[PDB]
Amino acid sequence: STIEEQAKTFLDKFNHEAEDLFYQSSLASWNYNTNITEENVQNMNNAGDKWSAFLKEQSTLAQMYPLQEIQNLTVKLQLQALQQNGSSVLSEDKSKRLNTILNTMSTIYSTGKVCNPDNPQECLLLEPGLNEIMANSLDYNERLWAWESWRSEVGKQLRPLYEEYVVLKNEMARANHYEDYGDYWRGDYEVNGVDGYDYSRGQLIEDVEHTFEEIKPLYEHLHAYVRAKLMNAYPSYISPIGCLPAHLLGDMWGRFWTNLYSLTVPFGQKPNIDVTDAMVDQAWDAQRIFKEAEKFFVSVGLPNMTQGFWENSMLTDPGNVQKAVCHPTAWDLGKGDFRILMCTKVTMDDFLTAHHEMGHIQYDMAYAAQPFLLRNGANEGFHEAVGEIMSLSAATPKHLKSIGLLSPDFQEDNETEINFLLKQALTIVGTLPFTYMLEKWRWMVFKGEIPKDQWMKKWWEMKREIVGVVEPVPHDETYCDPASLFHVSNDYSFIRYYTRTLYQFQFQEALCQAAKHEGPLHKCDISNSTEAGQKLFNMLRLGKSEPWTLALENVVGAKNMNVRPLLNYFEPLFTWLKDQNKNSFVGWSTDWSPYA
Amino acid sequence: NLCPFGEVFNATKFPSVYAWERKKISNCVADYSVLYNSTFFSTFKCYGVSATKLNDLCFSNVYADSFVVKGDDVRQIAPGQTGVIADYNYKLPDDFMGCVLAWNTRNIDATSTGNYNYKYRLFRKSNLKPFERDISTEIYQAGSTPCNGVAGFNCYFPLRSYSFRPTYGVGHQPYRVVVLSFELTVCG
Numbered sequence A: 001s002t003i004e005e006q007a008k009t010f011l012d013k014f015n016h017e018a019e020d021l022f023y024q025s026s027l028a029s030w031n032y033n034t035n036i037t038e039e040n041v042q043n044m045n046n047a048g049d050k051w052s053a054f055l056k057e058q059s060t061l062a063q064m065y066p067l068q069e070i071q072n073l074t075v076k077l078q079l080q081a082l083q084q085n086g087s088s089v090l091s092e093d094k095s096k097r098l099n100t101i102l103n104t105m106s107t108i109y110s111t112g113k114v115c116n117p118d119n120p121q122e123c124l125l126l127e128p129g130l131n132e133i134m135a136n137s138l139d140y141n142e143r144l145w146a147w148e149s150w151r152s153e154v155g156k157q158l159r160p161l162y163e164e165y166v167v168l169k170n171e172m173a174r175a176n177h178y179e180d181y182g183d184y185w186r187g188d189y190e191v192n193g194v195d196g197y198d199y200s201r202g203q204l205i206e207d208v209e210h211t212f213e214e215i216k217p218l219y220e221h222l223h224a225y226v227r228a229k230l231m232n233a234y235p236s237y238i239s240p241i242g243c244l245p246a247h248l249l250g251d252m253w254g255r256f257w258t259n260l261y262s263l264t265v266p267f268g269q270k271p272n273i274d275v276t277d278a279m280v281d282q283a284w285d286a287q288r289i290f291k292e293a294e295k296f297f298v299s300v301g302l303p304n305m306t307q308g309f310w311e312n313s314m315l316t317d318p319g320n321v322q323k324a325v326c327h328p329t330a331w332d333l334g335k336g337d338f339r340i341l342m343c344t345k346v347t348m349d350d351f352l353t354a355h356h357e358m359g360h361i362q363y364d365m366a367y368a369a370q371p372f373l374l375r376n377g378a379n380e381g382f383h384e385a386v387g388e389i390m391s392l393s394a395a396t397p398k399h400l401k402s403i404g405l406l407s408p409d410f411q412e413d414n415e416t417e418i419n420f421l422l423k424q425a426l427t428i429v430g431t432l433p434f435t436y437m438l439e440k441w442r443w444m445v446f447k448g449e450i451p452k453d454q455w456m457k458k459w460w461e462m463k464r465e466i467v468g469v470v471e472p473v474p475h476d477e478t479y480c481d482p483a484s485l486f487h488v489s490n491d492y493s494f495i496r497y498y499t500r501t502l503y504q505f506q507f508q509e510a511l512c513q514a515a516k517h518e519g520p521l522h523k524c525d526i527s528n529s530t531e532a533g534q535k536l537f538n539m540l541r542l543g544k545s546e547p548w549t550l551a552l553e554n555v556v557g558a559k560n561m562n563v564r565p566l567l568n569y570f571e572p573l574f575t576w577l578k579d580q581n582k583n584s585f586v587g588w589s590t591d592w593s594p595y596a
Numbered sequence B: 001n002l003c004p005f006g007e008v009f010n011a012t013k014f015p016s017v018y019a020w021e022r023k024k025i026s027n028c029v030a031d032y033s034v035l036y037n038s039t040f041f042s043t044f045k046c047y048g049v050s051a052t053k054l055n056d057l058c059f060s061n062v063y064a065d066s067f068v069v070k071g072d073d074v075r076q077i078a079p080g081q082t083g084v085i086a087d088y089n090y091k092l093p094d095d096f097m098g099c100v101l102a103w104n105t106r107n108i109d110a111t112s113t114g115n116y117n118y119k120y121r122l123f124r125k126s127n128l129k130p131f132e133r134d135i136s137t138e139i140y141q142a143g144s145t146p147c148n149g150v151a152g153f154n155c156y157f158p159l160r161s162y163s164f165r166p167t168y169g170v171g172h173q174p175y176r177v178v179v180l181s182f183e184l185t186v187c188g
């Protein structure tokens, strides 16, 4: 028998045996997030440990088939997925200690709380205590306190744990034939085998930096406009040529500038497009929100939601009689079981979120015919990009008027559109330098280019130069500000949020061309467009079988990420910002600080 | 006498697809109004004969095959299919003359804890001939190393059990299938 034919029959045994254990583990964690009890937290771990122990057994069994002896590219991808040693490449004690520090970091991040020196009886954790301050407060000292206390209290505890976290993760990646842990994460975009569609792990660094240079002009003008508005909010605190203080950006880390809309709104006189009160007056329930969202995907050619979706999803909060996690998630348990976990409220923000999460389900339903190890997005950024393009079309005034949520006589002025693009830019383009700089710092740390005695020294040197953000108070090596973010201390790659952002606008521009859109790109709604739905479905069905460069080409016609579609979305705002900054300073000096 | 169609359709226990059972129908008058004017079946596709002209028709004898497969596997209970069920469990001839009837049985054949009674053959040397039946539980040898009775590396058990649960999608829920074969006693 051919090694290729022995591996195919082995994958058949695996796909049937893994599909059953994965369903038991997925349903076990569902029964916990929808019914938080001690009996369900152990059933989640028991079915979870059984699936983990099963994956290790099939891992060493799959390694006895030489990957070089396989010529079929599809079966070659499945073997490589199982042959990953993962955390078992460590010794029994190093792997045991790695999970100990990973749990200690995750614990102190979620349970750490800081207390007010002015009122020691007032102690707040990150959510909702400190996040409410960073998002609403206009007091410089109150924000500076919450920003510094979070990085000096729970940040300093993560410093010794993150040091051991780096050395242990490097011993894993270097043992799995990788340069470092950063090289391990970049392997998600690696394509090796298809002529004309390959992509190396180092190519990601080259492409992310090349596309970021074209984002600088749009970001520099947004930075200059926000800084001018922030000086009116915090006089005698911000320099017209210096970087923005970190504690004045809208959240704990400056990841999103969304909370700065009230301070940077271009035209506050124009009416806000909030249809929240409209649905409340039309007697809408959570069933109508998801029924209307279901009708949206059907209007583009995609199928309805399965019966099991309407029978098993938790679309409302069960209340104090059944505690549940309210994070909007789209569950793909396998075996035709698709669910959505969301504590839906009759608001516009939940209306758009329902389109995002149901977009994930349409992606999951499409590649359900693929084998088990191939039922996933093209890369880590493809899944979030598909969900985001749905909320863009569903949020346009043309779509809200056609459904009946906006009045038919709502005038769309050129200032209402600048208001919308400015709010979009504070969230979308404002996070791009933050995302790139953060992952750039971790890439250098894993590669060994930033020594331990200058982790925070190099961290803020990059914050000033790349993001244009200066720390309000100096931090030595005792701090660990990057670990004060969830994704860093919880072992998650962060470059996915940069790539998905460029993907979603490449998808939108590509779909609106198939949708025969004629106006600006931000006013496009792909509703009632069966052509745009067929163009998108041709990529959703691929799953992870074809390379992401090929899957991306099936919709946008390009083998790599492109920034031009992102700039066309914010093009009306970019020319407006240049006019606003004609008497302002565009750029920043990396030397000014609010404490020199 | 009336032909006992209730003994096969309304039967409590249904066999697995790999060990499907067959029942011969001899001297008796049929009543196809019960089977055709009912929306209880999810699939009702006839081949070689029509779903209506059978009332004024006679055959030498009728053979009723019954088994249980998943929803997505019902498409393979048809002439000219090449799936796992058609190749290793139940194959129909190209010149098949009969009707295939299936209906969802999620409430009786799928339990919360997982109903592992219903099985199917996943591995087998070559495909089954039309109307052939294989109940062998011999260790399938996928490699060159002999298995010697004990399944190991490249030695897998030939049967795998369906895993029916009431929360599965409609494509993975249990469906009872009854295949009526016509061979040329039974009249309308």
Ligand SMILES: *[C@@H]1O[C@H](CO)[C@@H](O[C@@H]2O[C@H](CO)[C@@H](O[C@@H]3O[C@H](CO)[C@@H](O)[C@H](O)[C@@H]3O)[C@H](O)[C@H]2NC(C)=O)[C@H](O)[C@H]1NC(C)=O
Residues within 6 Å of the ligand: A008, A071, A072, A073, A074, A075, B082
């Ligand atoms: C890698 O291997 C896979 C599977 O070994 C190859 O795909 C397989 O291609 C055959 C030939 O078309 C498919 O069989 C067909 O099934 C349909 C079902 O109706 C039938 O009508 C045809 O007569 C034929 O029997 C088979 O389904 C398909 N496998 C899957 C999972 O879809 C693939 O081509 C190989 N790729 C390379 C690059 O070698």
Ligand SMILES: *[C@@H]1O[C@H](CO)[C@@H](O[C@@H]2O[C@H](CO)[C@@H](O[C@@H]3O[C@H](CO)[C@@H](O)[C@H](O)[C@@H]3O)[C@H](O)[C@H]2NC(C)=O)[C@H](O)[C@H]1NC(C)=O
Residues within 6 Å of the ligand: A299, A398, A399, A401, A402, A403, A525, A527, A528
């Ligand atoms: C996609 O095409 C459908 C075609 O039906 C569009 O739905 C239609 O939307 C209009 C409003 O834009 C609805 O008109 C309403 O009709 C009632 C009568 O029942 C009338 O009293 C109201 O004042 C209002 O004019 C129309 O009923 C509705 N179609 C159906 C079948 O209900 C949909 O808006 C299109 N989506 C787009 C263009 O994005």
Ligand SMILES: *[C@@H]1O[C@H](CO)[C@@H](O)[C@H](O)[C@H]1NC(C)=O
Residues within 6 Å of the ligand: A063, A083, A084, A085, A089, A176
């Ligand atoms: C996993 O570790 C074992 C331990 O020796 C090694 O033999 C094997 O090659 C490793 N797997 C890969 C894919 O490198």
Ligand SMILES: *[C@@H]1O[C@H](CO)[C@@H](O)[C@H](O)[C@H]1NC(C)=O
Residues within 6 Å of the ligand: A298, A303, A304
């Ligand atoms: C979708 O479901 C609705 C009921 O919710 C039904 O009326 C409609 O015909 C269905 N359409 C498709 C294409 O499934």
Ligand SMILES: *[C@@H]1O[C@H](CO)[C@@H](O)[C@H](O)[C@H]1NC(C)=O
Residues within 6 Å of the ligand: A414, A415, A418
């Ligand atoms: C909107 O358009 C009018 C003329 O159509 C123009 O005078 C005005 O300056 C525009 N507003 C903005 C913010 O560009």
Ligand SMILES: *[C@@H]1O[C@H](CO)[C@@H](O)[C@H](O)[C@H]1NC(C)=O
Residues within 6 Å of the ligand: B005, B006, B007, B009, B010, B034
């Ligand atoms: C099985 O019982 C149902 C009860 O409603 C009846 O309608 C049906 O005709 C019966 N099937 C047969 C084959 O007799």
Ligand SMILES: [Cl-]
Residues within 6 Å of the ligand: A246, A253, A481, A482
């Ligand atoms: Cl920071």
Ligand SMILES: [Cl-]
Residues within 6 Å of the ligand: A587, A588, A589
């Ligand atoms: Cl600069």
Ligand SMILES: [Zn+2]
Residues within 6 Å of the ligand: A356, A357, A360, A384, A387
């Ligand atoms: Zn999402």
